[PDB]
């Protein structure tokens, strides 16, 4: 379930397992030195049969690895206080105001902050000035009869902005 391709692969699947087991081993293991010991031990256990030219025995060892992992996880895996699941999970979302607002203000406060609204207005003219031709031509131009991907090409043509960028650029600053 991922934007790039239809699956992870074998490689990244093993990799995510290694990240999870190392993270759980943090969450199991305090004092950081025995942590470092057991981390090198775990790396050696993956080093034992890294170089199988076989594939089916490798993926079977992957499944038996997942069994001994899920038997040995932690009750509180150590989630960082910025991640979803974690302590924050858009903690300061109280002030994550989208910027389609701030133009519906009374012109007294548009007189209170003048230069900002002048440059914001030329931003919106930058948006609309290159909205129709380049962006919609680049979208209906390149792909197959079905799109069949979730990436999108840049604006390498000559000049102006890559397509469909407004709600990517204009976001909250994640600590206001």
Minimum CB–partner distance for residue 157 and other proteins (Å): 19
Q: Which of 58, 61, 99, 161 binds other proteins (CB under 8 A)?
A: 99
Tell me the site size for other proteins, rule CB under 8 A. 96
Does 70 bind other proteins (CB under 8 A)? Our answer is: yes
CB 20 within 8 A of CB 6: no
- The whole-angstrom separation of Cα 58 and Cα 46 is 11
Alpha helices for the chain (secondary structure H)? 10-28, 33-47, 56-70, 107-112, 114-129, 136-139, 166-169
Percent helix, strand, coil in the chain, to 5, is: 50, 0, 50
Of 113-172, which residues contact other proteins (CB under 8 A)?
113, 116, 124, 127-128, 131, 136, 139, 146-150, 164, 166-167
Shortest distance, position 114 Cβ to other proteins, whole Å: 13
Q: Cβ of residue 110: shortest distance to other proteins, in angstroms?
A: 10
Applying CB under 8 A, among 3, 114, 119, 158 the residue interacting with other proteins is: 3
Of residues 4-63, those binding other proteins (CB under 8 A): 4-7, 11-12, 15-19, 22, 25-34, 36-41, 43-44, 46, 59, 62-63
d(CA 80, CA 145): 43
Q: What are phi and psi of 142, to 5 degrees?
A: -75, -50
CB of 134 to other proteins, least distance (A): 13
């Amino acid at each position: 379930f991922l934007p790039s391709a239809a699956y992870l692969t074998h490689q990244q699947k093993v990799l995510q397992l290694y990240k999870r087991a190392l993270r759980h081993l943090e969450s199991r293991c305090v004092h950081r030195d025995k942590y470092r010991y057991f981390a090198c031990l775990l790396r050696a256990r993956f080093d034992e049969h890294k170089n199988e030219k076989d594939m089916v025995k490798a993926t079977q060892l992957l499944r038996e690895a997942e069994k001994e992992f899920w038997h040995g996880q932690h009750p509180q895996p150590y989630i960082f206080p910025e991640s979803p699941g974690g302590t924050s999970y858009e903690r300061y979302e109280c002030y994550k105001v989208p910027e389609w607002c701030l133009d519906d203000w009374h012109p007294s406060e548009k007189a209170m902050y003048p230069d900002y609204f002048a440059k914001r207005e030329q931003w919106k003219k930058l948006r609309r000035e290159s909205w129709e031709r380049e962006v919609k031509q680049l979208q209906e131009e390149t792909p197959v009869g079905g799109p069949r991907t979730e990436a999108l090409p840049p604006a390498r043509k000559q000049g102006d902005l890559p397509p469909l960028w407004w709600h990517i650029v204009t976001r909250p600053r994640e600590r206001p």
